């Protein structure tokens, strides 16, 4: 629900954070994911495919349980359903 | 400042219009190729009834008058390219694109990927179409319209374009009575909301999971 | 063959395929770029339902899997891409374009060329789509067929293809009965005939003329 | 109602000959026109645009009137008033 446009695929939504990093999708049917990287001159878009974000989804929800909160694990872990499940 | 596409071999011109003008009509010759910068541009066929049919609505950074890549400025367009908003746009003649590409290929591989996405929004809209329920016609172009002119807002996202239920009857194949009424069980539904003729759609993301 | 467009640095393969065999499905890699080179592909999307929409036709000497072009490899496949007929292709893993290009910058033009048809192409089946008369909309596609595989014959132009009511339902947004039902009308008005499962378009040119 | 495949466009018809160079047109609606000329290579088109391809079988008939047969020049006079009147 935080979104941002990609110059040539239009309006994406955030799926989550990584660290510094984020997971964004197109919000027609999440059809094409893509990593994020902000900076000083700045935002950068790598595509990525459905296995992988999902990998990363999985990855991030492993650190949420070791090392964060129980409220951004449960977050985080809807999302995951509703995006991947 | 885009201008720095420009060059001594690309020597592209900027062109602005006001809302309603016409880029290029039927019948003009196809000489420019033109890159949205600012702006919605509609292409449309008319028919001799006078009805139109939107065959696109491009956003910024769309590349259009495509068929001057094929034919130059001796074939004649047979779409209407008109000013949706306020728009700006880079205009070249087309016979320069060669002596440009082999001096920045950089520009090939640029352009290459402004008609891929071309074709893959084109398609989006055959898919949109192809639907046999008026309705899920409607949604599945509200959607189109999230992605391409959205804005973030307080109930969802507001698609950032004041629009006729005339120029959504031609953009779906439908009617304007048609469009009012389907609009109108949209908001029953509590799916949209309508203010000053800009529909916000309350969960885009939900409701395209709907059409998997 | 045209295998003359390969090199060291555009290392392409033939792939050929029997009738109904898919080319590409959802899910895939997007690792390639297609050229059709014999045949007839179709291009579709599926939803859950196992209801399909073609969303191309596509004829030979087109080129298909443009998404490779924008994410290449990375990204996932949306559409199913199927030899509709017995098909021959050449495939080239999408990585090898940039100094395939550099190379032989002549391989720039003819690609903008081709992705500039698929535009034009994609456009006139949204034309075709937004008719809301659908024995318009059948005309429309059946002119279509008929620039793409139509064959001169006794009686007209014969759209060279083999149409179930099925494909043609899938690629007109219309169902298998309704289609059915606008064959027999427009046989009855003796505008075509109809022969193991092959379409002729008596006077396609005098039709056209009919849209205007 | 003679046709011709181009390898881009598609099927065309013929809308009239002129001397061994031909006038073609677009199956959908004439939305282009081409310039066709044979030869043992051999088969080369040259789009032109509707008000030229006009005035070229315009030209033809100012031809036909003067130098060949009224069956011809009637036979063009039909093309030509079913193609651009
Ligand atoms: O670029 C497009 O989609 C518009 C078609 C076009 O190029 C034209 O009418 O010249
Ligand atoms: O080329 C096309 O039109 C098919 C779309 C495509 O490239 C894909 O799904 O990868």
Redesign the pocket.
Known sequence: ENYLNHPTFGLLYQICSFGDKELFATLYAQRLFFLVAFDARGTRFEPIGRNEARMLVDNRLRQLRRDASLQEYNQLQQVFKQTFL | MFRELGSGKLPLQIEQFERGKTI?F?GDP?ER??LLVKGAVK?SRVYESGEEIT??L?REN????????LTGQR?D???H?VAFTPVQLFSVPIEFMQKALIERPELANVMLQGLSS?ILQ?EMMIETLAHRDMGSRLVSFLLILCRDFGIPSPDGITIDLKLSHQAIAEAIGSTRVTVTRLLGDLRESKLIAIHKKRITVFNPVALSQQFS
Do not use: H
């Open positions: 290029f039927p196809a190729v033109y292409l065959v696109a491009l769309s590349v259009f008058g495509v068929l001057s890549l074939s367009r047979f779409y390219a071309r084109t």
